[PDB]
Amino acid sequence: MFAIVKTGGKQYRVEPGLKLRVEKLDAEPGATVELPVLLLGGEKTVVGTPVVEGASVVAEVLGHGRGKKILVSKFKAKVQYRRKKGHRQPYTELLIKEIRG
Amino acid sequence: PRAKTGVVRRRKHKKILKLAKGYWGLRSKSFRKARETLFAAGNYAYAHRKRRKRDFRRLWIVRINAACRQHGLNYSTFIHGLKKAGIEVDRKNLADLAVREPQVFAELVERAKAAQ
Amino acid sequence: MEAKAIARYVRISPRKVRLVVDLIRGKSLEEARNILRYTNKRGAYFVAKVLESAAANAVNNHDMLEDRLYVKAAYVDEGPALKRVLPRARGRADIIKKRTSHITVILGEKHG
Amino acid sequence: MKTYVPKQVEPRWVLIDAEGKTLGRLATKIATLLRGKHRPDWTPNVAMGDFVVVVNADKIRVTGKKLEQKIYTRYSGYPGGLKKIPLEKMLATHPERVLEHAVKGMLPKGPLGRRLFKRLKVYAGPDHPHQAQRPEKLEV
Amino acid sequence: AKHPVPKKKTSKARRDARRSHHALTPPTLVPCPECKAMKPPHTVCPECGYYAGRKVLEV
Amino acid sequence: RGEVAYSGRKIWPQKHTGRARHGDIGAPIFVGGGVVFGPKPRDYSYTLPKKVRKKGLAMAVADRAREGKLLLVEAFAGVNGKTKEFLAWAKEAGLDGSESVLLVTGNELVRRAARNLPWVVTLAPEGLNVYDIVRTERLVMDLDAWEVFQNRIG
RNA sequence: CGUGAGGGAAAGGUGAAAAGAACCCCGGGAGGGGAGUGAAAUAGAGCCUGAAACCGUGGGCUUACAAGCAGUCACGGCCCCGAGGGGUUGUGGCGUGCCUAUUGAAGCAUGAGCCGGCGACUCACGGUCGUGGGCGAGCUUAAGCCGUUGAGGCGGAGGC
RNA sequence: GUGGAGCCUGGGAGUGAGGGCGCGAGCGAUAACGUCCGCGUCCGAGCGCGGGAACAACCGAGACCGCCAGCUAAGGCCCCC
RNA sequence: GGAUGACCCCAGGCGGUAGGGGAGCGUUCCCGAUGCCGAUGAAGGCCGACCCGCGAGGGCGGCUGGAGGUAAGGGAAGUGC
């Protein structure tokens, strides 16, 4: 089995055992959550419209993080406009436990 | 009291030249040409961050459009099938499903032709 | 074991000397001695002496066999410049740089 | 997750009959085959497409008055070196270049763009020497 | 004349590219059939003094 | 640039020298030339309102008075100008030497003794100032000094 | 430097102590290699620290069908440190230096070889706003005199 | 109509070389990347982004940052793309 | 919301030249300091993919270096190329 789930405005394919970083979910570390499923596939194959009724992917949140700092700088020539900005986009690391569905 | 430059300027130049390591000629070794280079780099990265979301979506489409025609419809006709079918699987996973799990992508084709 | 000799402040332009030092790098000692003897270059004299002083060190100081010697390394670093005045036309005075060099030869035992 | 990048493909060999098909309307497809845009795993930065073996490019056909009117141009670098060749004469002299010139200009410019042009191997007459690869005869 | 002048400072890369033809070719030497020493070919041996097989000059 | 030693000659002409334009070498743009807005001798003093320095003097004592670190002594018994005398006296007065003390008394001998103690500042009551008050964790005063303290803040 | 008046530089640092390297080896010497001193000798007198441009040696990656403000985004290969990183860059995408002056510059308009250090909105007195406090129909002292020797107090002339 | 609206008193400015485009006229030749006004606009300062092959001012649209998510605008959908 | 910056929530604004404003980093120096860090290594130099900060910066570790450095909190300028 695999599942296409949607969290943090994006869609990711998940499987039991997989680790991934999605947008920062409001949850306590070590807790578990149900991710809404848009498609199941593998043995069976079920198509969401857009989602599926009794479908949920269980994930345990291992912890939240701050990505590698990305420098975003803007420079406008001949106009003495310079800006330096440091960005660490937060994330949440999840372990996909089981695919109910 | 007198405050000469002392340690300040070189430390700020050592900050910039470190961020310019890998550049060609004086672009990596000269502070001034490292600045003019790191300006351009700082803008290109901000643009190509924006352009990256554009780049992959186009790559996803071309692959989606490729696996569609193996079934007899084009990209445009397929996407509208998914809209009328109500399937919000995005183009990242769509193209992913096209190469790896074509039997699922084949099913998604049926739902698109049947929504017609 | 390695041996080393340096000829510091050799009054000659390093760029001219490296041309000769390139000939002997990685070469066996006797070969280099033969090479340096007939290279038609002012620098061949100096390189030959630093080489002979390094080979002497190996034998005398560092328990290395003369027959087992080769030029493991050799490089010409530039020393201070002797800035001299060259009178040009129209009253202008240029400044000629008469250049020194630090010639290094490093020897090792090539076993065969 | 990240986009699947394919392990190096084993390219396919393709045989097209060019006889009586329109010049630009066959050229544009052969470019798509060369570019590999028919492959679900299409990667824009590697050589991926097929090897398009074309025959009977002498019998390619074109519309209008383009036999007398369309003029392929060559510049030498010397004064007055602007050579003009009507599609007419080029067919009589080097007929394989008509398809090549058309197909080339529809491929990207740059390193990968030229590597793919080396994969198009045009011939006149019904025969081709690449039977060693056994190209799948395509109806396009 | 109007005193031609270099437009831009030549790069380290470019000047070293020019000097890619500047390596000295080692002196070509052959052994002297009398004293075996390395001497230039077609020259009176400077170590023993032989050539053609016979003594020619003092050493 | 006018107080520097160099002369006022224009080193080379204005134009046609192929070199940037300059005047005397006393200009601050030259190494060894003058400095532009570097310091001159200044008088930093200014007349704070007496009623502020008066209120400050009283308030500073008040802060020590609140936290109990104010002690008015009747006199200093066995101290006659020797330091070790004052040491034993501080030991009777609950002044071990772990709190910085402002000693304020009109007696020269008592002042003479504590002078060289690292944890004691000495003062004649006319010299009572809030800085030395705030510096000191404790404050000791002859009742001579307390008397004239009231006089100044009257 | 200038006939002269006159102009007018640069240039400091071994170490606690010379203990400043006897003597041996290559060399004409210079220089070095050992031995020796020293906590330290990349503290050896061309001496504390020893940055940068600059030059060189060695190694990893890469480069001879390739079109470039030199980067950037993506992917792949290789090398290193050990679902992660760092170095390199083959391909694809995108991409008109910095400053200055301009209606407008990548601009074939100004300035800059490069690097290091020096280099430009200050102070005084008055003014006028705002602001932090003291006092309030009042507020405040100036020079000075006294005191301390980084102590403060006096001084009402005068000024608002 | 609660808007980086308006009004009153003050402190601090900078600007007082504009430019293109649409309309309205004038000068010009119902010439000029012409010149001079009126209304508006954009550049100026948005030479940040999409289109227009490329191109300050034409069309689209006012970039706080991140995402390998989605919808559209002008413009596009044979290949380059 | 809690009650006067504790943090939390909801919503909206955040292109920008001349220019006005606000909040901060860093440099020399004074107080704090008859203290404190310091030969088990000061400042400075060389690294770093590590930690913190929007940033300017701060740390932290390794190497060099071989005698100085200086906190919370304030003060003053020959203060950032």
Ligand SMILES: [Mg+2]
């Ligand atoms: Mg559920």
Ligand SMILES: [Mg+2]
């Ligand atoms: Mg630009």
Ligand SMILES: [Mg+2]
């Ligand atoms: Mg501008």
Ligand SMILES: [Mg+2]
């Ligand atoms: Mg500028």
Ligand SMILES: [Mg+2]
């Ligand atoms: Mg300065």
Ligand SMILES: [Mg+2]
């Ligand atoms: Mg460097």
Ligand SMILES: [Mg+2]
């Ligand atoms: Mg859709």
Ligand SMILES: [Mg+2]
């Ligand atoms: Mg020169």
Ligand SMILES: [Mg+2]
């Ligand atoms: Mg292109």
Ligand SMILES: [Mg+2]
């Ligand atoms: Mg002539």
Ligand SMILES: [Mg+2]
């Ligand atoms: Mg000439």
Ligand SMILES: [Mg+2]
């Ligand atoms: Mg080189």
Ligand SMILES: [Mg+2]
């Ligand atoms: Mg060259």
Ligand SMILES: [Mg+2]
């Ligand atoms: Mg003068």
Ligand SMILES: [Mg+2]
């Ligand atoms: Mg005069």
Ligand SMILES: [Mg+2]
């Ligand atoms: Mg001039």
